[PDB]
Coordinates of C-alpha atoms and ligand atoms in Angstrom, one line a residue:
Chain A
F1 CA 97.7 44.9 62.7
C2 CA 98.5 46.7 66.2
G3 CA 96.5 44.6 68.6
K4 CA 92.4 44.0 68.0
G5 CA 90.4 47.1 67.4
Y6 CA 91.0 50.7 66.7
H7 CA 94.3 51.5 68.0
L8 CA 95.2 54.0 70.6
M9 CA 99.0 53.1 71.6
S10 CA 101.4 50.2 72.2
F11 CA 103.9 49.9 75.0
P12 CA 107.0 47.8 74.3
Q13 CA 108.8 45.9 76.8
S14 CA 112.0 43.8 76.6
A15 CA 112.3 40.4 77.2
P16 CA 115.0 37.7 77.0
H17 CA 115.4 37.1 73.2
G18 CA 112.2 39.1 72.6
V19 CA 109.9 41.9 72.8
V20 CA 106.2 42.1 74.1
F21 CA 103.7 44.9 73.0
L22 CA 101.0 45.9 75.4
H23 CA 98.5 47.3 72.7
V24 CA 95.7 49.8 74.3
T25 CA 92.9 49.8 71.7
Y26 CA 89.4 51.0 71.2
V27 CA 86.8 48.5 70.8
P28 CA 82.9 49.1 70.1
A29 CA 81.3 47.8 73.0
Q30 CA 77.3 48.0 72.1
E31 CA 75.6 48.2 68.9
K32 CA 72.3 49.7 68.0
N33 CA 70.4 49.9 64.7
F34 CA 69.4 53.4 63.0
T35 CA 67.8 54.5 59.9
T36 CA 70.3 56.0 57.6
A37 CA 70.3 58.5 54.6
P38 CA 73.0 59.8 52.3
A39 CA 71.8 63.5 52.1
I40 CA 68.9 65.9 53.3
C41 CA 66.8 67.8 50.5
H42 CA 66.0 71.2 52.2
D43 CA 64.8 74.1 50.2
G44 CA 65.2 72.2 47.0
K45 CA 69.0 71.9 47.8
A46 CA 70.8 68.7 48.6
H47 CA 72.8 68.7 51.9
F48 CA 75.8 66.1 52.3
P49 CA 77.4 65.7 55.7
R50 CA 80.9 67.2 56.0
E51 CA 81.8 64.7 58.8
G52 CA 79.7 61.8 60.1
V53 CA 76.5 59.9 58.7
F54 CA 73.0 60.8 59.1
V55 CA 71.0 58.5 61.6
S56 CA 67.1 58.8 62.6
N57 CA 65.6 57.8 66.0
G58 CA 61.8 57.6 65.7
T59 CA 61.0 60.2 62.9
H60 CA 63.8 62.9 63.7
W61 CA 67.3 63.2 62.4
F62 CA 70.7 63.7 63.4
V63 CA 74.2 63.5 62.1
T64 CA 76.8 61.7 64.4
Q65 CA 79.9 60.0 64.3
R66 CA 80.9 56.5 62.9
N67 CA 82.5 55.1 66.0
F68 CA 80.4 56.7 68.7
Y69 CA 76.6 57.8 69.0
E70 CA 76.9 61.4 69.7
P71 CA 73.8 62.9 68.0
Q72 CA 73.9 66.4 67.0
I73 CA 71.3 68.5 65.2
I74 CA 71.8 69.2 61.7
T75 CA 73.3 72.6 61.0
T76 CA 74.6 74.6 57.9
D77 CA 78.1 74.1 59.7
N78 CA 77.3 70.3 59.9
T79 CA 76.5 69.8 56.4
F80 CA 77.5 71.2 52.8
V81 CA 75.4 72.2 50.0
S82 CA 76.2 70.7 46.6
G83 CA 73.8 69.3 43.9
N84 CA 70.1 68.9 43.6
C85 CA 67.7 66.6 45.2
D86 CA 66.8 64.8 42.0
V87 CA 70.1 63.3 41.1
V88 CA 70.8 61.7 44.6
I89 CA 69.3 58.3 45.2
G90 CA 67.7 57.7 48.6
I91 CA 67.4 61.2 49.9
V92 CA 64.7 61.7 52.5
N93 CA 62.8 64.8 53.5
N94 CA 63.8 66.8 56.5
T95 CA 64.8 70.4 57.7
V96 CA 68.2 72.0 58.0
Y97 CA 68.3 74.4 61.1
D98 CA 70.7 77.3 60.7
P99 CA 72.4 79.1 63.7
Chain B
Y1 CA 89.1 18.4 65.6
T2 CA 88.5 20.3 62.5
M3 CA 90.3 23.7 62.6
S4 CA 88.2 26.6 63.6
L5 CA 87.5 29.2 61.1
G6 CA 86.5 31.3 64.1
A7 CA 83.5 32.4 65.8
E8 CA 80.2 32.4 63.8
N9 CA 78.6 35.8 63.3
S10 CA 75.7 37.3 61.1
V11 CA 75.0 40.6 60.1
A12 CA 72.0 41.8 57.9
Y13 CA 72.8 44.0 55.1
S14 CA 70.4 46.9 54.3
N15 CA 70.5 50.0 52.1
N16 CA 68.9 52.3 54.6
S17 CA 70.2 50.8 58.1
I18 CA 73.4 52.0 60.1
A19 CA 75.2 50.4 63.2
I20 CA 76.7 53.1 65.3
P21 CA 78.2 52.3 68.8
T22 CA 76.6 53.4 72.0
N23 CA 79.4 52.5 74.3
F24 CA 82.9 51.6 74.0
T25 CA 85.6 49.7 75.6
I26 CA 89.3 50.4 76.2
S27 CA 91.3 47.2 76.1
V28 CA 95.0 46.1 76.6
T29 CA 96.0 43.3 74.4
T30 CA 99.3 41.3 74.5
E31 CA 101.3 40.6 71.5
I32 CA 104.8 38.8 71.8
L33 CA 107.3 38.7 69.2
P34 CA 110.9 37.2 69.3
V35 CA 113.7 39.5 68.3
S36 CA 117.1 37.6 68.4
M37 CA 118.6 34.2 68.6
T38 CA 121.4 33.3 70.7
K39 CA 124.4 34.0 68.7
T40 CA 126.9 31.0 68.1
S41 CA 130.2 30.7 66.5
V42 CA 132.7 27.9 65.6
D43 CA 136.4 27.6 66.6
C44 CA 138.2 26.0 63.6
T45 CA 141.2 24.9 65.4
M46 CA 139.0 22.9 68.0
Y47 CA 136.8 21.5 65.2
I48 CA 139.3 20.4 62.9
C49 CA 142.4 19.6 64.9
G50 CA 141.2 18.9 68.6
Chain C
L1 CA 147.1 7.7 72.8
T2 CA 149.2 10.1 70.7
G3 CA 148.3 13.8 70.7
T4 CA 149.3 17.5 71.2
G5 CA 147.5 19.1 74.3
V6 CA 147.4 20.4 77.7
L7 CA 147.0 18.2 80.6
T8 CA 144.7 18.9 83.7
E9 CA 144.0 17.4 86.9
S10 CA 140.3 16.7 87.4
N11 CA 138.0 14.9 89.9
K12 CA 136.8 12.2 87.4
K13 CA 136.2 8.6 88.8
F14 CA 136.8 5.6 86.6
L15 CA 135.8 2.1 87.2
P16 CA 138.6 -0.2 86.8
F17 CA 137.5 -1.8 83.4
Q18 CA 137.3 1.7 82.0
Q19 CA 140.8 3.3 81.1
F20 CA 140.0 5.8 78.3
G21 CA 137.1 8.6 79.0
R22 CA 135.3 10.3 76.2
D23 CA 133.1 13.4 76.7
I24 CA 130.1 14.3 74.8
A25 CA 130.5 14.7 70.9
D26 CA 133.2 11.8 71.3
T27 CA 136.2 13.8 72.4
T28 CA 138.8 12.3 74.7
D29 CA 138.4 14.2 77.7
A30 CA 140.1 12.2 80.3
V31 CA 142.5 9.4 80.4
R32 CA 144.0 7.5 83.2
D33 CA 147.9 7.5 83.5
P34 CA 149.6 4.2 83.8
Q35 CA 152.4 5.0 86.3
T36 CA 150.5 7.2 88.3
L37 CA 146.7 6.3 88.7
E38 CA 145.5 9.9 88.8
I39 CA 142.9 10.6 86.2
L40 CA 144.2 13.5 83.9
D41 CA 141.7 15.6 81.9
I42 CA 142.8 16.5 78.3
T43 CA 142.4 20.1 77.4
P44 CA 143.6 21.8 74.0
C45 CA 146.7 23.3 73.3
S46 CA 145.0 26.8 72.1
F47 CA 141.7 27.7 73.2
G48 CA 141.2 29.3 69.9
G49 CA 138.9 32.1 70.8
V50 CA 141.2 35.0 69.8
Chain D
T1 CA 144.5 37.8 60.8
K2 CA 146.0 37.9 57.4
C3 CA 146.7 34.2 57.2
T4 CA 143.0 33.4 58.0
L5 CA 141.7 35.7 55.6
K6 CA 144.2 34.6 52.9
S7 CA 145.0 38.4 51.9
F8 CA 147.6 41.0 52.7
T9 CA 144.9 43.9 52.9
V10 CA 142.7 43.4 55.9
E11 CA 139.6 45.8 56.3
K12 CA 138.2 47.6 59.4
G13 CA 136.4 45.5 61.9
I14 CA 136.5 42.1 63.9
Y15 CA 137.9 39.1 62.4
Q16 CA 138.0 35.6 64.3
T17 CA 141.7 34.1 63.9
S18 CA 142.6 30.4 63.8
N19 CA 146.2 29.4 63.6
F20 CA 148.6 27.3 65.7
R21 CA 150.5 30.1 66.9
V22 CA 152.0 27.8 69.8
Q23 CA 153.7 25.0 67.9
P24 CA 155.0 22.9 70.7
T25 CA 158.5 21.7 70.8
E26 CA 158.3 19.1 73.9
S27 CA 157.4 15.2 73.5
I28 CA 156.7 13.1 76.5
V29 CA 155.7 9.5 76.6
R30 CA 154.2 7.7 79.8
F31 CA 154.0 3.9 79.6
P32 CA 153.5 1.7 82.7
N33 CA 156.2 -0.2 84.6
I34 CA 156.1 -3.4 82.8
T35 CA 159.6 -4.2 81.6
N36 CA 159.8 -8.1 81.3
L37 CA 160.0 -9.3 77.7
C38 CA 156.9 -11.0 76.3
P39 CA 157.1 -14.9 75.6
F40 CA 157.3 -14.4 71.9
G41 CA 160.3 -16.7 71.9
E42 CA 158.2 -19.5 73.3
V43 CA 155.3 -19.1 70.7
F44 CA 157.7 -18.5 67.7
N45 CA 160.2 -21.3 68.4
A46 CA 158.1 -24.0 70.0
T47 CA 159.3 -27.4 68.8
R48 CA 155.8 -28.5 68.0
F49 CA 152.8 -26.2 66.8
Chain E
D1 CA 114.8 -2.0 50.5
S2 CA 118.5 -2.7 51.3
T3 CA 119.7 -5.3 53.9
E4 CA 121.7 -4.2 57.1
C5 CA 119.1 -1.4 57.3
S6 CA 119.7 -0.8 61.0
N7 CA 123.5 -0.2 60.6
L8 CA 123.2 2.1 57.7
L9 CA 120.4 4.1 59.4
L10 CA 122.3 4.2 62.9
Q11 CA 125.4 5.3 60.8
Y12 CA 123.8 8.0 58.5
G13 CA 120.5 8.7 59.8
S14 CA 121.0 12.1 61.9
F15 CA 122.2 13.8 58.7
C16 CA 119.0 12.8 56.8
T17 CA 117.1 13.8 60.0
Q18 CA 118.4 17.1 60.2
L19 CA 117.6 17.6 56.3
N20 CA 114.0 16.4 57.1
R21 CA 113.7 18.9 60.0
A22 CA 114.8 21.6 57.5
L23 CA 112.2 20.6 55.1
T24 CA 109.7 20.1 57.7
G25 CA 110.5 23.7 58.9
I26 CA 110.1 24.8 55.3
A27 CA 106.5 23.3 55.1
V28 CA 105.4 24.7 58.3
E29 CA 106.8 28.1 57.1
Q30 CA 104.6 27.9 54.1
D31 CA 101.6 26.8 56.2
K32 CA 102.5 30.0 58.5
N33 CA 102.5 32.2 55.4
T34 CA 99.1 30.9 54.3
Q35 CA 97.7 31.6 57.8
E36 CA 99.4 35.1 57.6
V37 CA 97.5 36.2 54.4
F38 CA 94.3 34.5 54.5
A39 CA 93.6 34.7 58.3
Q40 CA 93.5 38.3 59.1
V41 CA 90.1 38.0 60.5
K42 CA 88.3 35.0 62.5
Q43 CA 84.9 36.2 62.2
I44 CA 82.8 34.5 59.4
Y45 CA 80.2 36.4 57.7
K46 CA 77.4 35.7 55.1
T47 CA 75.7 37.8 52.6
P48 CA 72.1 37.2 52.0
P49 CA 71.2 39.8 49.2
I50 CA 72.9 40.1 45.7
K51 CA 72.0 43.0 44.2
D52 CA 71.4 45.8 46.5
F53 CA 75.0 47.3 47.0
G54 CA 73.9 50.4 45.3
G55 CA 73.6 49.1 41.6
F56 CA 77.1 47.2 41.9
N57 CA 76.6 43.5 40.6
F58 CA 78.6 41.0 42.6
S59 CA 77.3 37.7 41.5
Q60 CA 80.7 36.3 40.1
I61 CA 83.3 37.6 42.8
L62 CA 80.9 36.7 45.9
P63 CA 80.5 32.9 46.4
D64 CA 77.5 31.6 44.5
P65 CA 74.7 30.1 46.7
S66 CA 73.3 26.3 46.7
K67 CA 76.6 24.7 45.6
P68 CA 78.6 22.0 47.5
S69 CA 82.0 23.9 46.8
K70 CA 82.1 27.5 48.7
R71 CA 83.9 28.7 45.4
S72 CA 83.2 31.6 43.2
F73 CA 83.1 31.8 39.3
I74 CA 86.2 33.7 39.3
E75 CA 87.7 31.2 41.5
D76 CA 86.4 28.4 39.5
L77 CA 88.3 29.9 36.5
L78 CA 91.4 30.3 38.8
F79 CA 91.6 26.7 39.9
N80 CA 90.6 25.7 36.3
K81 CA 93.3 27.5 34.2
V82 CA 96.3 26.3 36.2
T83 CA 97.5 22.9 35.3
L84 CA 99.7 20.6 37.7
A85 CA 106.8 7.7 47.5
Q86 CA 108.5 4.9 45.6
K87 CA 108.3 6.9 42.4
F88 CA 110.2 9.6 44.3
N89 CA 112.5 7.6 46.1
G90 CA 111.1 8.7 49.4
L91 CA 110.3 12.3 48.7
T92 CA 106.5 12.8 49.7
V93 CA 104.2 15.7 49.2
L94 CA 102.8 17.1 52.5
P95 CA 99.2 18.4 52.0
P96 CA 98.6 22.0 53.3
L97 CA 97.2 22.3 56.8
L98 CA 94.5 24.9 55.4
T99 CA 92.5 23.1 52.7
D100 CA 91.2 25.1 49.6
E101 CA 87.8 24.9 50.9
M102 CA 88.7 26.8 54.0
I103 CA 91.0 29.2 51.9
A104 CA 87.9 30.0 49.9
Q105 CA 85.6 30.2 53.0
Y106 CA 88.2 32.9 54.4
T107 CA 88.1 34.8 51.1
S108 CA 84.1 34.8 51.3
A109 CA 84.4 36.0 54.9
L110 CA 86.6 38.8 54.0
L111 CA 84.5 39.7 51.0
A112 CA 81.1 39.4 53.2
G113 CA 82.6 41.6 56.1
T114 CA 84.2 43.9 53.7
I115 CA 80.9 44.6 51.7
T116 CA 78.6 44.6 54.8
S117 CA 81.0 46.8 57.0
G118 CA 83.6 48.7 55.5
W119 CA 86.8 48.7 57.6
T120 CA 84.9 48.1 60.8
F121 CA 84.5 44.1 60.8
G122 CA 88.1 43.4 61.5
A123 CA 88.1 46.0 64.6
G124 CA 85.3 44.2 66.7
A125 CA 81.6 43.7 66.4
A126 CA 80.5 44.2 62.8
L127 CA 78.6 47.4 62.1
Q128 CA 76.4 47.4 59.0
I129 CA 76.8 50.2 56.4
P130 CA 75.3 50.6 53.0
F131 CA 77.8 50.2 50.1
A132 CA 77.0 53.5 48.7
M133 CA 78.0 55.3 52.0
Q134 CA 81.1 53.0 52.3
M135 CA 82.1 54.3 48.7
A136 CA 81.4 57.9 50.0
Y137 CA 83.6 57.3 52.8
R138 CA 86.4 55.9 50.6
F139 CA 86.0 58.9 48.3
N140 CA 86.4 61.3 51.2
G141 CA 89.5 59.4 52.2
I142 CA 91.0 59.9 48.8
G143 CA 90.3 63.6 48.8
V144 CA 87.3 63.9 46.4
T145 CA 84.0 65.2 47.7
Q146 CA 81.4 62.4 48.2
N147 CA 78.8 64.6 46.5
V148 CA 80.3 63.3 42.9
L149 CA 79.4 59.7 43.9
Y150 CA 75.6 60.4 44.6
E151 CA 75.7 62.4 41.3
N152 CA 77.0 59.5 39.4
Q153 CA 76.2 56.3 41.2
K154 CA 74.7 54.6 38.1
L155 CA 77.9 55.4 36.1
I156 CA 80.4 54.2 38.6
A157 CA 78.3 51.0 39.1
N158 CA 78.1 50.4 35.1
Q159 CA 82.0 51.2 34.8
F160 CA 82.6 48.5 37.7
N161 CA 80.4 45.9 36.0
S162 CA 81.9 46.4 32.6
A163 CA 85.4 46.2 34.2
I164 CA 84.6 42.9 36.0
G165 CA 83.0 41.6 32.7
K166 CA 86.2 42.5 30.8
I167 CA 88.2 40.8 33.6
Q168 CA 85.9 37.8 33.3
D169 CA 86.5 37.5 29.5
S170 CA 90.1 37.9 30.0
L171 CA 90.2 35.1 32.5
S172 CA 87.8 32.9 30.4
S173 CA 89.8 33.3 27.1
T174 CA 93.0 31.4 26.5
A175 CA 96.0 33.4 27.4
Ligands
LIG1 C1 65.0 60.9 69.7 O1 65.8 61.5 70.6 C2 65.7 62.8 70.5 C3 66.8 63.4 71.5 O2 66.2 63.2 72.9 C4 64.2 63.3 70.8 O3 63.9 64.7 70.8 C5 63.6 65.0 72.0 O4 62.4 64.9 72.3 C6 61.6 65.5 73.3 C7 60.4 64.9 73.1 O5 59.6 65.0 71.8 C8 61.7 67.0 73.2 O6 61.2 67.4 74.4 C9 63.2 67.2 72.9 O7 63.2 68.9 72.9 C10 63.6 66.7 71.8 N1 65.2 67.1 71.9 C11 65.8 67.1 70.6 C12 67.3 67.3 70.9 O8 65.3 67.0 69.7 C13 63.3 62.5 69.8 O9 61.9 62.9 70.1 C14 63.5 61.2 69.8 N2 62.7 60.4 68.9 C15 62.0 59.4 69.1 C16 60.5 59.6 69.5 O10 62.8 58.1 69.1
LIG2 C1 59.9 66.0 49.5 O1 59.3 67.1 49.3 C2 59.0 67.5 47.8 C3 58.5 68.8 47.9 O2 59.1 69.8 48.8 C4 58.2 66.4 47.3 O3 57.9 66.6 45.9 C5 56.5 66.7 45.6 O4 56.0 65.3 45.5 C6 54.7 65.5 45.1 C7 54.1 64.0 45.0 O5 54.4 63.5 43.6 C8 54.1 66.3 43.7 O6 52.9 66.1 43.6 C9 54.9 67.5 43.9 O7 54.6 68.2 42.7 C10 56.2 67.5 44.3 N1 56.8 68.9 44.5 C11 58.0 69.3 44.1 C12 58.3 70.9 44.6 O8 58.8 68.5 43.3 C13 58.5 65.0 47.5 O9 57.7 64.1 46.9 C14 58.9 64.9 49.1 N2 59.6 63.3 49.1 C15 58.9 62.4 49.9 C16 59.8 61.2 50.2 O10 57.9 62.8 50.6
LIG3 C1 79.8 51.6 79.2 O1 80.3 50.5 79.7 C2 80.9 50.8 81.1 C3 81.5 49.5 81.6 O2 82.9 49.4 81.6 C4 79.9 51.2 82.0 O3 80.4 51.7 83.3 C5 79.8 51.1 84.4 O4 78.5 51.8 85.0 C6 77.7 51.1 86.0 C7 76.7 52.1 86.2 O5 77.2 53.3 86.9 C8 78.8 50.9 87.1 O6 77.8 50.3 88.1 C9 79.7 50.0 86.6 O7 80.6 49.8 87.6 C10 80.6 50.7 85.7 N1 81.8 49.9 85.1 C11 83.1 50.1 85.4 C12 83.8 49.2 84.9 O8 83.4 51.1 86.3 C13 79.1 52.4 81.5 O9 78.0 52.8 82.2 C14 78.6 52.2 80.0 N2 78.1 53.4 79.5 C15 76.8 53.5 79.0 C16 76.5 54.6 78.4 O10 76.1 52.4 79.1
LIG4 C1 75.5 40.0 37.1 O1 76.3 39.7 36.1 C2 76.2 38.3 35.7 C3 77.0 37.9 34.5 O2 77.8 39.0 34.4 C4 74.4 38.2 35.3 O3 74.3 36.6 34.8 C5 73.6 36.5 33.9 O4 72.3 36.3 34.1 C6 71.2 36.2 33.2 C7 69.9 36.2 33.5 O5 69.7 37.1 34.5 C8 71.8 35.1 32.2 O6 70.9 34.9 30.9 C9 73.3 35.0 31.8 O7 73.6 34.2 31.1 C10 74.0 35.3 33.0 N1 75.5 35.6 32.8 C11 76.5 34.8 32.9 C12 77.7 35.0 32.3 O8 76.4 33.5 33.3 C13 73.5 38.6 36.5 O9 72.4 38.6 36.0 C14 73.9 39.9 36.8 N2 73.2 40.4 37.9 C15 71.9 41.0 37.6 C16 71.3 41.4 38.7 O10 71.6 41.2 36.6
LIG5 C1 69.2 45.3 64.1 O1 68.1 44.5 63.5 C2 68.4 43.1 63.2 C3 67.5 42.6 62.4 O2 66.0 43.0 62.9 C4 68.7 42.2 64.5 O3 68.9 40.8 64.3 C5 69.7 42.8 65.3 O4 69.6 42.3 66.6 C6 69.4 44.5 65.6 N1 70.5 44.9 66.2 C7 70.6 45.2 67.5 C8 71.8 45.9 68.1 O5 69.6 44.8 68.3
LIG6 C1 66.3 48.9 49.6 O1 66.0 47.5 49.8 C2 64.8 47.1 49.9 C3 64.7 45.6 50.1 O2 64.4 45.0 48.9 C4 63.7 47.6 48.6 O3 62.5 47.2 48.8 C5 64.0 48.9 48.4 O4 63.5 49.4 47.0 C6 65.7 49.5 48.4 N1 65.8 50.9 48.3 C7 66.6 51.4 47.3 C8 66.6 53.1 47.4 O5 67.3 50.6 46.6
LIG7 C1 155.9 2.4 88.9 O1 156.9 2.6 89.8 C2 157.0 4.1 90.5 C3 158.2 3.9 91.1 O2 159.2 3.1 90.7 C4 155.7 4.0 91.4 O3 155.6 5.2 92.1 C5 154.3 3.8 90.8 O4 153.3 3.8 91.6 C6 154.6 2.4 89.8 N1 153.4 2.3 89.1 C7 152.8 1.0 88.8 C8 151.5 0.8 87.9 O5 153.1 0.0 89.4
LIG8 C1 164.9 -22.6 69.0 O1 165.1 -23.8 68.8 C2 166.0 -24.5 67.9 C3 166.2 -26.0 68.2 O2 165.2 -26.6 68.1 C4 167.5 -23.7 68.0 O3 168.4 -24.3 67.1 C5 167.2 -22.1 67.8 O4 168.6 -21.6 67.9 C6 166.2 -21.6 68.8 N1 166.1 -20.1 68.6 C7 166.5 -19.5 69.3 C8 165.6 -18.0 69.5 O5 167.4 -19.4 70.1

């Protein structure tokens, strides 16, 4: 709606019988595949991400943002605890570090 | 020519695959929108009588 | 040419076969007086922009 | 303004007004210096048509 | 078909020409509305799989494969259920600039991009995402935690399938 991509700002400038908008926008530059999982089963408990999605590089797992690859180690601050491992579909086995 | 629907693209849906950006681009685009049309009016004495 | 209006002296040149002058949108802007051969511009009695 | 709106009460704002406020009282005629009479007598009264 | 056609046209043609410019402006305005609604995104996408969207059946709203028309079954019912120069003394019907095939293709591209990529596809390069994780993000946007979704994925899938089946039966029956 406001330019093309994720919107940062728009600067208006006048024009004779018109207005021109300079839209500063955010565009994802490069792409990369990752393996993903909905939740992590640790100590018999299901862990769901508070913010971000789970990605995997090789065998090891991180949680990261949807719009930028900033891998952070999974922590009890990063994920919240709810449910059980049985009812969730697609859960993988991993560990949850705690500070 | 036939009207372009746009650039052709293909993405492979998967139940266990995600695509996360590694780099980002800050872009300035231009959108031009008309605001007003030049106001006109008619003089009735000139239009009818002259 | 019978009409009520204001007369104006203008620098408009007429060919000898052309007596009456019409402006754009067929109004009579200019006319050549018979007694004095000056070309006289025709302007409205009221400008009407009040 | 009252005449153009066609009402005694006029509300607040701008109103374009059209009316012959002038009403000129002067008539001028300018015809060329020709004053000799036309030969209508010859055409109408010719002995032979 | 009258005689002295040139004189009548010269005497009364620009009035009709102005009215025809008005009608042409109306027509190009309607084409502008069609492009305004059906052409948000120019990127065209295709959906290979049919039944891996977290148990959600999408056979009838997505365009079916192996048919010359890009039309879906629901859009088949939509075009089926609605019934439509000398004859009109010169009034003509201009065809739409966007034909129905590319309108169906635009809807197909919107559906394919939405299902494959969430909200991302219009921003730039399409980022693939599972449909269940997209539903988790939509629930998080609403305000309910995503843990409900993975606790009742089959229930929501069955409710969605039953709802679209009810819509199919409503549109198929005469009403
Ligand atoms: C994925 O990337 C992470 C982060 O770089 C790798 O984890 C590191 O691996 C090296 C070698 O195994 C260790 O020395 C570091 O201590 C690890 N750091 C972290 C943050 O875990 C991980 O090995 C990579 N996985 C693969 C092989 O793709
Ligand atoms: C994740 O770990 C759990 C246990 O921590 C695994 O559950 C075991 O699965 C084996 C294989 O059938 C059974 O013999 C055990 O009885 C299970 N143990 C428990 C406590 O349920 C589970 O299979 C692992 N998941 C994966 C994908 O490897
Ligand atoms: C993301 O893309 C930008 C391009 O805008 C990269 O910046 C370039 O980095 C190289 C290597 O240092 C420089 O030679 C170029 O001059 C940079 N470009 C500009 C416009 O300054 C950036 O390195 C990329 N980031 C990653 C992680 O790949
Ligand atoms: C999704 O729903 C459609 C219709 O609701 C299913 O299509 C049916 O398919 C079976 C064979 O699998 C046919 O016998 C039926 O006649 C079809 N129904 C109609 C209305 O044509 C489709 O199978 C469903 N998807 C899955 C994966 O089961
Ligand atoms: C992700 O995988 C698909 C299929 O293997 C491939 O076509 C695509 O190029 C990959 N993505 C990137 C960024 O390489
Ligand atoms: C994901 O899709 C693949 C491809 O068919 C399939 O083999 C696998 O069973 C699917 N997994 C889940 C959890 O749906
Ligand atoms: C008519 O006569 C006047 C003076 O008697 C003279 O100034 C004028 O030029 C004459 N006009 C013509 C057309 O003869
Ligand atoms: C026209 O000529 C006749 C004689 O043929 C004459 O009697 C008559 O009076 C003339 N008319 C005029 C205008 O004098």
